Amino acid sequence: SSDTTPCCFAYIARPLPRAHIKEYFYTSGKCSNPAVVFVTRKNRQVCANPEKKWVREYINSLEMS
Amino acid sequence: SSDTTPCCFAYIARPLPRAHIKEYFYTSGKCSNPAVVFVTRKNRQVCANPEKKWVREYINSLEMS
Amino acid sequence: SSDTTPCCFAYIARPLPRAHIKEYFYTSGKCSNPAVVFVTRKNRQVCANPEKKWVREYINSLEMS
Amino acid sequence: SSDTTPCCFAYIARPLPRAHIKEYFYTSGKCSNPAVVFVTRKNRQVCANPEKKWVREYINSLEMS
Amino acid sequence: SSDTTPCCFAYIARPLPRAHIKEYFYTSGKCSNPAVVFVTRKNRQVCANPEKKWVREYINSLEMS
Amino acid sequence: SSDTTPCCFAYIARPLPRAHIKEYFYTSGKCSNPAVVFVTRKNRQVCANPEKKWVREYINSLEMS
Amino acid sequence: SSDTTPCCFAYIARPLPRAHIKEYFYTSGKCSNPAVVFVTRKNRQVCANPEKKWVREYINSLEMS
Amino acid sequence: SSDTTPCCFAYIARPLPRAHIKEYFYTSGKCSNPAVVFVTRKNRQVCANPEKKWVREYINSLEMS
Amino acid sequence: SSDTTPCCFAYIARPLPRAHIKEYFYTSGKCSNPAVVFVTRKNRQVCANPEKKWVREYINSLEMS
Ligand SMILES: OC[C@H]1O[C@@H](O)[C@H](O)[C@@H](O)[C@@H]1O
Ligand SMILES: OC[C@H]1O[C@@H](O)[C@H](O)[C@@H](O)[C@@H]1O
Ligand SMILES: OC[C@H]1O[C@@H](O)[C@H](O)[C@@H](O)[C@@H]1O
Ligand SMILES: OC[C@H]1O[C@@H](O)[C@H](O)[C@@H](O)[C@@H]1O
Ligand SMILES: OC[C@H]1O[C@@H](O)[C@H](O)[C@@H](O)[C@@H]1O
Ligand SMILES: *[C@H]1O[C@H](CO)[C@H](O)[C@H](O)[C@H]1O
Ligand SMILES: *[C@H]1O[C@H](CO)[C@H](O)[C@H](O)[C@H]1O
Ligand SMILES: *[C@H]1O[C@H](CO)[C@H](O)[C@H](O)[C@H]1O
Ligand SMILES: *[C@H]1O[C@H](CO)[C@H](O)[C@H](O)[C@H]1O
Ligand SMILES: *[C@H]1O[C@H](CO)[C@H](O)[C@H](O)[C@H]1O
Ligand SMILES: *[C@H]1O[C@H](CO)[C@H](O)[C@H](O)[C@H]1O
Ligand SMILES: [Cl-]
Ligand SMILES: [Cl-]
Ligand SMILES: [Cl-]
Ligand SMILES: [Cl-]
Ligand SMILES: [Cl-]
Ligand SMILES: [Cl-]
Ligand SMILES: [Cl-]
Ligand SMILES: [Cl-]
Ligand SMILES: [Cl-]
Ligand SMILES: [Cl-]
Ligand SMILES: [Cl-]
Ligand SMILES: [Cl-]
Ligand SMILES: [Cl-]
Ligand SMILES: [Cl-]
Ligand SMILES: [Cl-]
Ligand SMILES: [Cl-]
Ligand SMILES: [Cl-]
Ligand SMILES: [Cl-]
Ligand SMILES: [Cl-]
Ligand SMILES: [Cl-]
């Protein structure tokens, strides 16, 4: 186990393919920049802006299943 | 006693969507900071500030179902 | 994923059986108390005193295996 | 790969066993808090304060082979 | 470990042979240009245009397997 | 050209010790931020601000021997 | 080794025009005085003090071309 | 070859004909007075003040071909 | 014209073939090491030990021709 925290300082511009996304998570509140991280099936991890529509829709899609 | 207990040391500013939350709990009073943790349908866990209005509203909504 | 942190507030009195320990970790520096956590074969987390000899020996055993 | 960055927001107080440490690294400059992360043989990861003598000594020990 | 980031400034013209791709990832959101990087079996990183059909199909192939 | 190139988007404030640096290089002029990367004996890589006095002193020392 | 190497034993105070410089190099570390030599388009060669701010500004500019 | 250095201790006031100049050079930093030497086709050599505009313009003209 | 000075830090071991030598000169008194430089027909500069008999004979040959 690790004491480090994953933070984001920038976001991807174009929406990654929804079908590739395995899960998501909100970055810690200690992070200076609020962000969402999408995790793909092969464990690519992409920082996303929670203020974006497609990001919110993706999260909504993941939770409601 | 000797079991770990979850503590929060910060809160994200942006409120997570009410419809995603399935339950909540208070962190132990032994923690340095008072906190509420919202658990989502997919078991994402977010620390929240109990002194915030929207947090209170969420808890009320969760309790009054 | 969760942004809560496993913190300890008490140390186990009786040394755990070594053959039950599958792994260990140090609690975050965010926690007010320094602590070692052992994870058992049954995935239970047990806080232990970092200064105790058996604790240091278990850790050294786990790392040097 | 991932575009999240490991950040530290607190430091361990007690020096961890030098012999357990496999490597170290400096956290990114994006991180609000400057830190050093020690990585053990079994990949425990511990945040450390680079302004501490034992931390600097450990780093010196690691890089000088 | 390094705090530099792999960024792209040009996209390969000829589609890479699929059988040589062993991994992909998206460049950080910090990079000025959006890009897809394919990692070859010879461990070389190749920038590709995210909009190109063969690029999206390669990614989709890599994630769904 | 289709190869990725290292870019820096921040610098740690605390100068790493001169003695563990074995080499340096400038990031591509295509990067949004001008930067120097110091490579340690154990191949840690740290982004540095070329406009800083200590960075230039280090480079001079590395190149004058 | 038996070949001569250029050394500098002083520096002109007034910085030469940046636009005139096409390249630069460090004198050998064997030279008693550390120095940078700027080479103009018409191949004039001027000794410069590497500890000067404008000199490192020039070098940085020449590198992030 | 010679280890004497050409130095200037005064400057011409009247600008010499640009078309007569085939080259220029900065006097060494060893010289007490910073200066520019213009060399004519028939190898007349004139000391000039680099702080004067016409001198700078002449140099700029020579370097930029 | 250049502000740098040709200095030597090593003496050639095998005496140059006399017929290859075009001219000679003494390195500046500014150089930390005394030396003789022979200029070859191919316009290369070779540092030589000023104490060696063959060096002094070559110089004597060149001056008394
Ligand atoms: O990864 C989430 C949590 O991990 C802990 O190790 C860190 O100390 C916390 O600050 C963080 O919120
Ligand atoms: O790739 C690793 C990370 O290094 C950090 O320094 C950067 O802020 C990130 O943008 C980058 O993704
Ligand atoms: O002008 C080209 C210059 O390149 C440098 O690397 C050499 O040390 C100089 O001797 C040479 O004059
Ligand atoms: O590593 C950067 C290199 O850039 C070249 O242009 C310089 O002449 C070298 O002195 C330098 O080492
Ligand atoms: O230092 C001795 C002198 O020798 C001459 O050849 C150089 O042009 C001067 O710059 C130098 O100062
Ligand atoms: C790492 O340690 C345990 C798992 O061993 C737990 O998930 C903690 O939350 C994490 O920091
Ligand atoms: C969420 O949990 C930890 C951090 O909380 C880590 O990044 C995991 O990869 C992710 O699933
Ligand atoms: C992860 O992706 C590649 C490796 O595949 C690279 O090392 C980057 O540094 C990281 O983002
Ligand atoms: C250093 O590289 C990345 C971050 O730069 C990651 O945390 C690795 O685990 C570490 O060794
Ligand atoms: C004179 O000697 C050689 C030419 O033979 C060289 O140019 C030196 O720089 C100069 O002092
Ligand atoms: C510049 O080179 C030497 C001195 O550096 C000499 O004066 C020449 O005449 C000039 O062209
Ligand atoms: Cl965005
Ligand atoms: Cl899914
Ligand atoms: Cl609900
Ligand atoms: Cl409020
Ligand atoms: Cl606590
Ligand atoms: Cl004991
Ligand atoms: Cl500390
Ligand atoms: Cl080691
Ligand atoms: Cl941060
Ligand atoms: Cl150190
Ligand atoms: Cl960039
Ligand atoms: Cl393209
Ligand atoms: Cl296409
Ligand atoms: Cl070194
Ligand atoms: Cl230029
Ligand atoms: Cl620059
Ligand atoms: Cl004048
Ligand atoms: Cl001309
Ligand atoms: Cl010298
Ligand atoms: Cl001899």
Distance CA G11, CA C11 (A): 68
Closest partner residue to E7 among F5, F12, F45, by Cβ? F5
Distance CA B27, CA B41 (A): 19
Cβ contact B31:A51 at 8 Å: no
Distance CA F11, CA B20 (A): 38
Q: H or E segment at D53?
A: helix D53-63
- The terminus-to-terminus CA distance of chain H in angstroms comes to 29
Residue of E1, E5, E28 best suited for mutating to test ligand 9, as the one with most atoms within 8 Å of CB? E1
The residue behind tokens 């010679």 is H2
What CATH number is given to the structural domain containing G16?
2.40.50.40
Distance CA B59, CA C13 (A): 37
A28, B7, E35, E43, H20 from C2: Cα distances, Å: 8, 11, 30, 34, 79
- The radius of gyration of chain C from alpha carbons, rounded to an integer in Å, stands at 12
Strands of chain B (E only): list them. 5-7, 21-26, 36-40, 45-48
Closest among B35, B39, B50 to B16, alpha carbons compared: B39
Other C-beta atoms closer than 10 Å to the C-beta of E49 total 18
Cβ contact F15:F30 at 8 Å: no
Is the dihedral angle over the CA atoms A30, A34, A36, A37 positive or is it negative?
negative
Share of chain G residues as helix, strand and coil, in percent rounded to the nearest 5:
20, 30, 50
Resolution (A): 2.5
Helix locations, G1-65, DSSP H: 53-63
Distance CA D17, CA D61 (A): 13
- The residue type of A40 is T
* Letter string b/e over residues B6-33, b meaning 16 or more CB atoms within 10 A of that residue's CB: bbbbbbbeeebeeebbeebeebeeebee
Cβ contact H7:H32 at 8 Å: yes
Ligand 2 in reach of A9 Cβ (< 6 A): yes
E33: domain range? 1-65
Give the gap in angstroms from C-alpha D48 to the nearest C-alpha of chain F: 14
- The residue type of I1 is S
The residue behind tokens 């004198």 is G27
| Domain total of chain H | 1
Distance CA A38, CA A24 (A): 4
Closest partner residue to E3 among D2, D3, D28, by Cβ? D28
Distance CA B32, CA C32 (A): 7
CA of E50 to the centre of ligand 24 (A): 9
Distance CA E37, CA E27 (A): 7
Distance CA G60, CA H12 (A): 36
* Best to test chain D binding among E3, E27, E47, E62 (most D CBs inside 10 Å): E3
Pairing state between β F36-40 and G21-26: unpaired
Instruction: Give the residue on C whose Cα is nearest the Cα of A30.
Output: C3
* Letter string b/e over residues I35-65, b meaning 16 or more CB atoms within 10 A of that residue's CB: bbbbbeeeeebbbbbbeeeebeebbeeeeee
Distance CA H46, CA H39 (A): 7
Closest among F26, F62, A31 to D28, alpha carbons compared: A31
Q: What is residue G47's DSSP assignment?
A: E
DSSP code string of chain H: --------SS--SSPPPGGGEEEEEEPPTTSSS--EEEEETT--EEEE-TTSHHHHHHHHHHHT-
Closest among C63, F41, C50 to D40, alpha carbons compared: C63
Strand order in the sheet with G45-48: G21-26, G36-40, G45-48
Give every CB contact of residue F5 below 8 A, 6+ residues apart in sequence: E6, E7, E8, E9, F27, F28, F30, F31
Cβ contact F37:F27 at 8 Å: yes
Give every CB contact of residue A27 below 8 A, 6+ residues apart in sequence: A5, A6, A7, A8, A33, A34, A35, A36, A37, B12, C3, D4
- The residue type of H19 is A
- The residue type of G30 is K
A10, B22, C20 from A23: Cα distances, Å: 19, 17, 32
- The residue type of H46 is V
Query: How many CA atoms lie less than 13 Å away from I21 in the CB half-sphere?
Result: 22
Distance CA G2, CA C34 (A): 63
Distance CA G37, CA G49 (A): 9
The token pair at C26 is 């140090």
Cβ contact I6:I27 at 8 Å: yes
Which chain F residues contact residue D29 at CB under 8 A? 8-13, 47
Give every CB contact of residue F6 below 8 A, 6+ residues apart in sequence: E2, E4, E5, E6, E7, F27, F28, F31, F37, F45
Strand order in the sheet with C36-40: C21-26, C36-40, C45-48
Is the dihedral angle over the CA atoms F59, F61, G1, G3 positive or is it negative?
positive
